[PDB]
mmCIF file of N, CA and C and ligand atoms in Angstrom:
data_model
loop_
_atom_site.group_PDB
_atom_site.id
_atom_site.type_symbol
_atom_site.label_atom_id
_atom_site.label_comp_id
_atom_site.label_asym_id
_atom_site.label_seq_id
_atom_site.Cartn_x
_atom_site.Cartn_y
_atom_site.Cartn_z
ATOM 1 N N UNK A 1 -0.749 12.167 6.310
ATOM 2 C CA UNK A 1 -1.807 12.689 7.222
ATOM 3 C C UNK A 1 -2.958 11.646 7.442
ATOM 4 N N UNK A 2 -2.415 10.381 7.683
ATOM 5 C CA UNK A 2 -3.316 9.426 7.816
ATOM 6 C C UNK A 2 -3.658 8.790 6.370
ATOM 7 N N UNK A 3 -3.689 9.583 5.488
ATOM 8 C CA UNK A 3 -3.982 9.140 4.130
ATOM 9 C C UNK A 3 -2.884 9.536 3.266
ATOM 10 N N UNK A 4 -2.277 8.558 2.504
ATOM 11 C CA UNK A 4 -1.057 8.777 1.665
ATOM 12 C C UNK A 4 -1.508 8.630 0.167
ATOM 13 N N UNK A 5 -1.701 9.829 -0.507
ATOM 14 C CA UNK A 5 -2.015 9.749 -1.887
ATOM 15 C C UNK A 5 -0.878 9.495 -2.732
ATOM 16 N N UNK A 6 -1.057 8.387 -3.511
ATOM 17 C CA UNK A 6 0.097 7.927 -4.426
ATOM 18 C C UNK A 6 -0.402 8.448 -5.813
ATOM 19 N N UNK A 7 -0.133 9.720 -6.133
ATOM 20 C CA UNK A 7 -0.277 10.245 -7.489
ATOM 21 C C UNK A 7 -0.009 9.260 -8.496
ATOM 22 N N UNK A 8 -1.059 8.965 -9.335
ATOM 23 C CA UNK A 8 -0.921 7.969 -10.387
ATOM 24 C C UNK A 8 -1.332 8.614 -11.654
ATOM 25 N N UNK A 9 -0.672 8.184 -12.696
ATOM 26 C CA UNK A 9 -1.088 8.645 -14.029
ATOM 27 C C UNK A 9 -2.417 7.978 -14.623
ATOM 28 N N UNK A 10 -2.773 6.955 -13.822
ATOM 29 C CA UNK A 10 -3.963 6.162 -14.213
ATOM 30 C C UNK A 10 -4.859 6.144 -12.925
ATOM 31 N N UNK A 11 -5.350 7.204 -12.409
ATOM 32 C CA UNK A 11 -6.151 7.271 -11.049
ATOM 33 C C UNK A 11 -5.246 7.330 -9.990
ATOM 34 N N UNK A 12 -5.645 8.062 -8.903
ATOM 35 C CA UNK A 12 -4.976 8.133 -7.588
ATOM 36 C C UNK A 12 -5.319 7.026 -6.915
ATOM 37 N N UNK A 13 -4.574 6.910 -5.656
ATOM 38 C CA UNK A 13 -4.875 5.756 -4.851
ATOM 39 C C UNK A 13 -4.956 6.403 -3.379
ATOM 40 N N UNK A 14 -6.026 6.212 -2.872
ATOM 41 C CA UNK A 14 -6.431 6.600 -1.529
ATOM 42 C C UNK A 14 -6.032 5.420 -0.438
ATOM 43 N N UNK A 15 -4.779 5.523 0.111
ATOM 44 C CA UNK A 15 -4.322 4.612 1.081
ATOM 45 C C UNK A 15 -4.167 5.197 2.449
ATOM 46 N N UNK A 16 -4.903 4.812 3.438
ATOM 47 C CA UNK A 16 -4.918 5.140 4.788
ATOM 48 C C UNK A 16 -3.708 4.435 5.563
ATOM 49 N N UNK A 17 -2.664 5.336 5.837
ATOM 50 C CA UNK A 17 -1.528 4.606 6.484
ATOM 51 C C UNK A 17 -1.916 4.513 8.042
ATOM 52 N N UNK A 18 -2.092 5.579 8.606
ATOM 53 C CA UNK A 18 -2.416 5.640 9.888
ATOM 54 C C UNK A 18 -3.303 4.413 10.285
ATOM 55 N N UNK A 19 -4.117 4.028 9.334
ATOM 56 C CA UNK A 19 -5.089 2.926 9.395
ATOM 57 C C UNK A 19 -4.191 1.619 9.258
ATOM 58 N N UNK A 20 -3.494 1.654 8.190
ATOM 59 C CA UNK A 20 -2.688 0.401 7.833
ATOM 60 C C UNK A 20 -1.606 0.320 8.920
ATOM 61 N N UNK A 21 -1.413 1.239 9.808
ATOM 62 C CA UNK A 21 -0.457 1.117 10.747
ATOM 63 C C UNK A 21 -0.588 -0.135 11.746
ATOM 64 N N UNK A 22 -1.581 -0.734 11.597
ATOM 65 C CA UNK A 22 -1.903 -1.833 12.355
ATOM 66 C C UNK A 22 -2.292 -3.066 11.226
ATOM 67 N N UNK A 23 -2.815 -4.131 11.676
ATOM 68 C CA UNK A 23 -3.138 -5.341 10.961
ATOM 69 C C UNK A 23 -1.880 -5.956 10.407
ATOM 70 N N UNK A 24 -0.867 -5.706 11.000
ATOM 71 C CA UNK A 24 0.490 -6.104 10.830
ATOM 72 C C UNK A 24 1.200 -6.686 12.113
ATOM 73 N N UNK A 25 1.776 -7.884 11.943
ATOM 74 C CA UNK A 25 2.439 -8.641 13.057
ATOM 75 C C UNK A 25 2.983 -7.405 13.973
ATOM 76 N N UNK A 26 3.963 -6.810 13.474
ATOM 77 C CA UNK A 26 4.568 -5.716 14.378
ATOM 78 C C UNK A 26 5.286 -4.743 13.433
ATOM 79 N N UNK A 27 4.689 -4.367 12.344
ATOM 80 C CA UNK A 27 5.365 -3.424 11.451
ATOM 81 C C UNK A 27 6.700 -4.118 10.867
ATOM 82 N N UNK A 28 7.145 -3.305 10.003
ATOM 83 C CA UNK A 28 8.511 -3.673 9.567
ATOM 84 C C UNK A 28 8.406 -4.744 8.482
ATOM 85 N N UNK A 29 7.078 -4.874 7.900
ATOM 86 C CA UNK A 29 6.903 -5.824 6.910
ATOM 87 C C UNK A 29 6.943 -5.200 5.600
ATOM 88 N N UNK A 30 6.512 -4.031 5.415
ATOM 89 C CA UNK A 30 6.590 -3.364 4.047
ATOM 90 C C UNK A 30 7.945 -2.554 4.073
ATOM 91 N N UNK A 31 8.236 -1.726 5.127
ATOM 92 C CA UNK A 31 9.392 -1.000 5.338
ATOM 93 C C UNK A 31 10.541 -1.896 5.492
ATOM 94 N N UNK A 32 10.434 -3.019 6.242
ATOM 95 C CA UNK A 32 11.585 -3.699 6.327
ATOM 96 C C UNK A 32 12.507 -3.488 7.440
ATOM 97 N N UNK A 33 11.981 -2.719 8.419
ATOM 98 C CA UNK A 33 12.904 -2.223 9.644
ATOM 99 C C UNK A 33 13.490 -0.902 9.103
ATOM 100 N N UNK A 34 12.709 0.187 9.229
ATOM 101 C CA UNK A 34 13.246 1.411 8.799
ATOM 102 C C UNK A 34 12.247 2.203 8.072
ATOM 103 N N UNK A 35 11.835 3.425 8.567
ATOM 104 C CA UNK A 35 10.877 4.352 7.933
ATOM 105 C C UNK A 35 11.538 4.984 6.788
ATOM 106 N N UNK A 36 10.944 5.991 6.359
ATOM 107 C CA UNK A 36 11.474 6.942 5.261
ATOM 108 C C UNK A 36 11.054 6.303 3.855
ATOM 109 N N UNK A 37 11.544 6.896 2.773
ATOM 110 C CA UNK A 37 11.173 6.501 1.464
ATOM 111 C C UNK A 37 11.422 5.014 1.399
ATOM 112 N N UNK A 38 10.527 4.197 0.789
ATOM 113 C CA UNK A 38 10.730 2.909 0.651
ATOM 114 C C UNK A 38 11.403 2.773 -0.677
ATOM 115 N N UNK A 39 12.781 2.576 -0.697
ATOM 116 C CA UNK A 39 13.588 2.462 -1.715
ATOM 117 C C UNK A 39 12.908 3.146 -3.032
ATOM 118 N N UNK A 40 13.106 2.419 -4.080
ATOM 119 C CA UNK A 40 12.615 3.148 -5.297
ATOM 120 C C UNK A 40 11.185 2.495 -5.634
ATOM 121 N N UNK A 41 10.285 2.515 -4.618
ATOM 122 C CA UNK A 41 8.982 2.085 -4.862
ATOM 123 C C UNK A 41 8.565 2.278 -6.317
ATOM 124 N N UNK A 42 8.595 1.276 -7.116
ATOM 125 C CA UNK A 42 8.148 1.395 -8.583
ATOM 126 C C UNK A 42 6.597 1.051 -8.743
ATOM 127 N N UNK A 43 6.233 1.195 -9.886
ATOM 128 C CA UNK A 43 4.701 0.847 -10.193
ATOM 129 C C UNK A 43 4.625 -0.612 -10.106
ATOM 130 N N UNK A 44 5.652 -1.355 -10.363
ATOM 131 C CA UNK A 44 5.551 -2.769 -10.552
ATOM 132 C C UNK A 44 5.566 -3.314 -8.994
ATOM 133 N N UNK A 45 6.329 -2.684 -8.190
ATOM 134 C CA UNK A 45 6.391 -3.033 -6.844
ATOM 135 C C UNK A 45 4.975 -3.066 -6.204
ATOM 136 N N UNK A 46 4.238 -2.066 -6.580
ATOM 137 C CA UNK A 46 2.738 -1.746 -5.980
ATOM 138 C C UNK A 46 2.002 -3.105 -6.180
ATOM 139 N N UNK A 47 1.822 -3.452 -7.452
ATOM 140 C CA UNK A 47 1.219 -4.707 -7.813
ATOM 141 C C UNK A 47 2.000 -5.927 -7.288
ATOM 142 N N UNK A 48 3.265 -5.659 -6.991
ATOM 143 C CA UNK A 48 4.088 -6.818 -6.430
ATOM 144 C C UNK A 48 3.646 -7.222 -4.877
ATOM 145 N N UNK A 49 4.658 -7.284 -4.164
ATOM 146 C CA UNK A 49 4.433 -7.755 -2.781
ATOM 147 C C UNK A 49 4.572 -6.461 -1.913
ATOM 148 N N UNK A 50 3.962 -5.355 -2.288
ATOM 149 C CA UNK A 50 4.112 -4.177 -1.533
ATOM 150 C C UNK A 50 2.780 -3.351 -1.540
ATOM 151 N N UNK A 51 1.552 -3.819 -1.709
ATOM 152 C CA UNK A 51 0.412 -3.298 -2.051
ATOM 153 C C UNK A 51 -0.693 -4.423 -2.180
ATOM 154 N N UNK A 52 -0.688 -5.143 -3.333
ATOM 155 C CA UNK A 52 -1.566 -6.001 -3.681
ATOM 156 C C UNK A 52 -0.944 -7.361 -3.237
ATOM 157 N N UNK A 53 0.207 -7.799 -3.570
ATOM 158 C CA UNK A 53 0.844 -9.030 -3.200
ATOM 159 C C UNK A 53 0.313 -9.356 -1.795
ATOM 160 N N UNK A 54 0.489 -8.356 -0.936
ATOM 161 C CA UNK A 54 0.027 -8.471 0.461
ATOM 162 C C UNK A 54 -1.309 -9.193 0.391
ATOM 163 N N UNK A 55 -2.247 -8.496 0.359
ATOM 164 C CA UNK A 55 -3.708 -8.883 0.407
ATOM 165 C C UNK A 55 -3.767 -10.232 -0.368
ATOM 166 N N UNK A 56 -3.105 -10.396 -1.619
ATOM 167 C CA UNK A 56 -3.134 -11.744 -2.251
ATOM 168 C C UNK A 56 -2.883 -12.894 -1.264
ATOM 169 N N UNK A 57 -1.948 -12.521 -0.264
ATOM 170 C CA UNK A 57 -1.497 -13.621 0.620
ATOM 171 C C UNK A 57 -2.321 -13.290 1.998
ATOM 172 N N UNK A 58 -2.246 -11.962 2.365
ATOM 173 C CA UNK A 58 -2.885 -11.652 3.606
ATOM 174 C C UNK A 58 -4.439 -12.175 3.741
ATOM 175 N N UNK A 59 -4.966 -12.480 2.592
ATOM 176 C CA UNK A 59 -6.183 -12.978 2.391
ATOM 177 C C UNK A 59 -7.243 -11.853 2.899
ATOM 178 N N UNK A 60 -6.717 -10.699 3.058
ATOM 179 C CA UNK A 60 -7.449 -9.553 3.596
ATOM 180 C C UNK A 60 -7.194 -8.463 2.663
ATOM 181 N N UNK A 61 -8.104 -7.694 2.187
ATOM 182 C CA UNK A 61 -8.066 -6.502 1.449
ATOM 183 C C UNK A 61 -8.611 -6.622 0.085
ATOM 184 N N UNK A 62 -8.698 -5.596 -0.731
ATOM 185 C CA UNK A 62 -9.274 -5.589 -2.041
ATOM 186 C C UNK A 62 -8.121 -5.696 -3.030
ATOM 187 N N UNK A 63 -8.354 -6.317 -4.196
ATOM 188 C CA UNK A 63 -7.343 -6.439 -5.137
ATOM 189 C C UNK A 63 -7.705 -5.756 -6.402
ATOM 190 N N UNK A 64 -9.002 -5.359 -6.615
ATOM 191 C CA UNK A 64 -9.637 -4.791 -7.770
ATOM 192 C C UNK A 64 -8.822 -3.418 -7.861
ATOM 193 N N UNK A 65 -8.867 -2.924 -9.182
ATOM 194 C CA UNK A 65 -8.291 -1.705 -9.491
ATOM 195 C C UNK A 65 -9.060 -0.486 -8.902
ATOM 196 N N UNK A 66 -10.323 -0.610 -9.244
ATOM 197 C CA UNK A 66 -11.239 0.485 -8.695
ATOM 198 C C UNK A 66 -11.238 0.457 -7.230
ATOM 199 N N UNK A 67 -10.783 -0.535 -6.674
ATOM 200 C CA UNK A 67 -10.642 -0.667 -5.169
ATOM 201 C C UNK A 67 -9.339 0.359 -4.842
ATOM 202 N N UNK A 68 -8.447 0.261 -5.516
ATOM 203 C CA UNK A 68 -7.183 1.044 -5.153
ATOM 204 C C UNK A 68 -7.155 2.298 -6.148
ATOM 205 N N UNK A 69 -7.423 2.181 -7.286
ATOM 206 C CA UNK A 69 -7.445 3.288 -8.289
ATOM 207 C C UNK A 69 -8.981 3.874 -8.197
ATOM 208 N N UNK A 70 -9.010 5.373 -8.096
ATOM 209 C CA UNK A 70 -10.353 5.909 -8.068
ATOM 210 C C UNK A 70 -10.155 7.235 -8.635
ATOM 211 N N UNK A 71 -11.223 7.746 -9.303
ATOM 212 C CA UNK A 71 -11.325 9.073 -9.891
ATOM 213 C C UNK A 71 -12.194 10.073 -9.120
HETATM 214 C C1 HEC B 1 1.597 -1.977 4.748
HETATM 215 C C2 HEC B 1 2.953 -1.499 4.679
HETATM 216 C C3 HEC B 1 3.240 -0.414 5.732
HETATM 217 C C4 HEC B 1 3.571 -0.577 7.013
HETATM 218 C C5 HEC B 1 3.201 -1.768 7.970
HETATM 219 C C6 HEC B 1 3.852 0.731 7.453
HETATM 220 N N1 HEC B 1 3.932 1.609 6.495
HETATM 221 FE FE1 HEC B 1 4.744 3.517 6.755
HETATM 222 N N2 HEC B 1 4.601 3.658 4.714
HETATM 223 C C7 HEC B 1 4.034 2.819 3.758
HETATM 224 C C8 HEC B 1 4.076 3.376 2.355
HETATM 225 C C9 HEC B 1 3.547 2.723 1.237
HETATM 226 C C10 HEC B 1 4.559 4.551 2.575
HETATM 227 C C11 HEC B 1 4.647 5.730 1.483
HETATM 228 C C12 HEC B 1 6.145 5.502 0.818
HETATM 229 C C13 HEC B 1 6.217 6.489 -0.417
HETATM 230 O O1 HEC B 1 5.049 6.853 -1.034
HETATM 231 O O2 HEC B 1 7.338 6.766 -0.783
HETATM 232 C C14 HEC B 1 4.926 4.831 3.908
HETATM 233 C C15 HEC B 1 5.567 6.070 4.371
HETATM 234 C C16 HEC B 1 5.901 6.223 5.652
HETATM 235 C C17 HEC B 1 6.606 7.352 6.317
HETATM 236 C C18 HEC B 1 6.867 8.668 5.336
HETATM 237 C C19 HEC B 1 6.045 9.924 5.871
HETATM 238 C C20 HEC B 1 4.647 9.449 6.265
HETATM 239 O O3 HEC B 1 4.212 9.921 7.225
HETATM 240 O O4 HEC B 1 4.094 8.473 5.542
HETATM 241 C C21 HEC B 1 6.794 7.154 7.538
HETATM 242 C C22 HEC B 1 7.285 8.243 8.432
HETATM 243 C C23 HEC B 1 6.281 5.909 7.954
HETATM 244 N N3 HEC B 1 5.644 5.382 6.771
HETATM 245 C C24 HEC B 1 6.396 5.292 9.182
HETATM 246 C C25 HEC B 1 5.884 4.090 9.496
HETATM 247 C C26 HEC B 1 6.077 3.350 10.734
HETATM 248 C C27 HEC B 1 6.981 3.895 11.873
HETATM 249 C C28 HEC B 1 5.501 2.143 10.842
HETATM 250 C C29 HEC B 1 5.469 1.138 11.629
HETATM 251 C C30 HEC B 1 6.804 1.204 12.681
HETATM 252 C C31 HEC B 1 4.871 2.213 9.410
HETATM 253 N N4 HEC B 1 5.097 3.306 8.694
HETATM 254 C C32 HEC B 1 4.155 1.003 8.866
HETATM 255 C C33 HEC B 1 3.771 1.555 4.105
HETATM 256 C C34 HEC B 1 3.655 1.039 5.332
HETATM 257 C C1 HEC B 2 1.324 -6.175 5.007
HETATM 258 C C2 HEC B 2 0.234 -6.478 3.878
HETATM 259 C C3 HEC B 2 -0.262 -5.185 3.227
HETATM 260 C C4 HEC B 2 0.205 -4.332 2.389
HETATM 261 C C5 HEC B 2 1.480 -4.320 1.689
HETATM 262 C C6 HEC B 2 -0.692 -3.377 2.123
HETATM 263 N N1 HEC B 2 -1.775 -3.497 2.829
HETATM 264 FE FE1 HEC B 2 -3.855 -3.062 2.488
HETATM 265 N N2 HEC B 2 -4.571 -4.329 3.767
HETATM 266 C C7 HEC B 2 -3.824 -5.024 4.612
HETATM 267 C C8 HEC B 2 -4.771 -5.493 5.735
HETATM 268 C C9 HEC B 2 -4.239 -6.546 6.903
HETATM 269 C C10 HEC B 2 -6.014 -5.030 5.540
HETATM 270 C C11 HEC B 2 -7.176 -5.329 6.325
HETATM 271 C C12 HEC B 2 -7.724 -4.058 6.859
HETATM 272 C C13 HEC B 2 -9.008 -4.348 7.691
HETATM 273 O O1 HEC B 2 -9.146 -5.481 8.282
HETATM 274 O O2 HEC B 2 -9.945 -3.563 7.687
HETATM 275 C C14 HEC B 2 -5.871 -4.422 4.239
HETATM 276 C C15 HEC B 2 -6.929 -3.632 3.642
HETATM 277 C C16 HEC B 2 -6.900 -2.717 2.567
HETATM 278 C C17 HEC B 2 -7.958 -1.898 2.114
HETATM 279 C C18 HEC B 2 -9.494 -2.068 2.598
HETATM 280 C C19 HEC B 2 -9.743 -1.184 3.767
HETATM 281 C C20 HEC B 2 -9.860 0.219 3.207
HETATM 282 O O3 HEC B 2 -9.044 1.102 3.626
HETATM 283 O O4 HEC B 2 -10.650 0.510 2.335
HETATM 284 C C21 HEC B 2 -7.448 -1.160 1.227
HETATM 285 C C22 HEC B 2 -8.310 -0.160 0.412
HETATM 286 C C23 HEC B 2 -6.118 -1.396 1.093
HETATM 287 N N3 HEC B 2 -5.666 -2.300 1.940
HETATM 288 C C24 HEC B 2 -5.166 -0.683 0.323
HETATM 289 C C25 HEC B 2 -3.849 -0.822 0.210
HETATM 290 C C26 HEC B 2 -2.900 -0.180 -0.747
HETATM 291 C C27 HEC B 2 -3.339 0.799 -1.647
HETATM 292 C C28 HEC B 2 -1.736 -0.576 -0.547
HETATM 293 C C29 HEC B 2 -0.315 -0.118 -1.070
HETATM 294 C C30 HEC B 2 -0.093 1.350 -0.961
HETATM 295 C C31 HEC B 2 -1.874 -1.604 0.651
HETATM 296 N N4 HEC B 2 -3.069 -1.763 0.901
HETATM 297 C C32 HEC B 2 -0.577 -2.268 1.112
HETATM 298 C C33 HEC B 2 -2.400 -5.268 4.568
HETATM 299 C C34 HEC B 2 -1.601 -4.767 3.590
HETATM 300 C C1 HEC B 3 -3.706 -2.808 -4.172
HETATM 301 C C2 HEC B 3 -3.927 -1.511 -4.758
HETATM 302 C C3 HEC B 3 -3.778 -1.597 -6.289
HETATM 303 C C4 HEC B 3 -4.588 -2.371 -7.128
HETATM 304 C C5 HEC B 3 -5.574 -3.422 -6.738
HETATM 305 C C6 HEC B 3 -4.130 -1.988 -8.520
HETATM 306 N N1 HEC B 3 -3.105 -0.980 -8.457
HETATM 307 FE FE1 HEC B 3 -2.316 -0.258 -10.061
HETATM 308 N N2 HEC B 3 -1.196 0.900 -8.870
HETATM 309 C C7 HEC B 3 -1.135 0.989 -7.569
HETATM 310 C C8 HEC B 3 -0.235 1.845 -7.003
HETATM 311 C C9 HEC B 3 -0.008 2.274 -5.502
HETATM 312 C C10 HEC B 3 0.348 2.494 -8.117
HETATM 313 C C11 HEC B 3 1.598 3.508 -8.130
HETATM 314 C C12 HEC B 3 0.907 4.929 -7.803
HETATM 315 C C13 HEC B 3 2.156 5.820 -7.342
HETATM 316 O O1 HEC B 3 2.623 5.562 -6.330
HETATM 317 O O2 HEC B 3 2.351 6.715 -8.175
HETATM 318 C C14 HEC B 3 -0.080 1.930 -9.188
HETATM 319 C C15 HEC B 3 0.222 2.184 -10.413
HETATM 320 C C16 HEC B 3 -0.329 1.604 -11.665
HETATM 321 C C17 HEC B 3 0.093 1.914 -12.962
HETATM 322 C C18 HEC B 3 1.225 2.870 -13.405
HETATM 323 C C19 HEC B 3 1.078 4.274 -12.792
HETATM 324 C C20 HEC B 3 1.326 5.097 -13.931
HETATM 325 O O3 HEC B 3 2.538 5.605 -13.937
HETATM 326 O O4 HEC B 3 0.439 5.466 -14.671
HETATM 327 C C21 HEC B 3 -0.736 1.227 -13.732
HETATM 328 C C22 HEC B 3 -0.782 1.154 -15.277
HETATM 329 C C23 HEC B 3 -1.775 0.416 -13.087
HETATM 330 N N3 HEC B 3 -1.499 0.754 -11.640
HETATM 331 C C24 HEC B 3 -2.702 -0.220 -13.282
HETATM 332 C C25 HEC B 3 -3.535 -1.088 -12.674
HETATM 333 C C26 HEC B 3 -4.562 -2.032 -13.098
HETATM 334 C C27 HEC B 3 -4.871 -2.254 -14.649
HETATM 335 C C28 HEC B 3 -5.208 -2.527 -12.207
HETATM 336 C C29 HEC B 3 -6.312 -3.557 -11.986
HETATM 337 C C30 HEC B 3 -6.197 -4.701 -13.157
HETATM 338 C C31 HEC B 3 -4.537 -2.037 -10.895
HETATM 339 N N4 HEC B 3 -3.517 -1.210 -11.250
HETATM 340 C C32 HEC B 3 -5.034 -2.340 -9.634
HETATM 341 C C33 HEC B 3 -2.049 0.273 -6.693
HETATM 342 C C34 HEC B 3 -2.825 -0.867 -7.220
#
């Protein structure tokens, strides 16, 4: 519903999808062409190239934990 809560054992993550729906070439960057559950999105993938990794390269976004993780 615009905001996708990623229940975490170490603080939840408030990620605005409807918001992230843009700022991307033409979507299909994360999904890889196809909606639905993104494979077995693991905790490693998050910090990988499917959450942070992006920003790390996108040069846009927060990389801090408190930025992603919040109580
Ligand atoms: C920045 C990466 C990214 C982009 C770009 C993106 N999404 Fe998502 N999308 C996600 C993530 C992360 C989830 C949550 C997957 C999970 O939690 O299992 C998700 C979940 C979804 C879901 C599952 C239910 C829901 O409503 O969230 C749908 C449907 C979806 N995306 C559609 C799209 C479509 C269609 C596009 C563009 C054509 C798009 N998304 C663009 C990251 C992205
Ligand atoms: C395709 C690369 C990409 C991926 C993957 C991606 N994002 Fe972003 N992120 C961006 C872009 C682009 C912006 C810039 C948004 C702006 O300009 O306001 C951004 C900005 C943000 C911001 C700052 C704006 C805000 O809403 O507070 C947060 C927080 C954020 N991302 C969290 C996440 C989280 C959490 C995930 C993983 C579920 C994620 N992002 C996955 C591209 C990505
Ligand atoms: C760009 C957003 C983002 C940033 C920055 C980030 N994380 Fe994460 N982290 C996530 C997401 C998303 C998950 C998975 C949550 C889910 O989907 O259940 C996660 C999961 C985790 C998990 C495992 C989840 C569990 O099962 O408890 C740990 C540990 C973790 N993060 C530690 C950190 C630490 C430490 C930092 C800072 C040094 C950090 N994270 C910063 C997005 C981020």
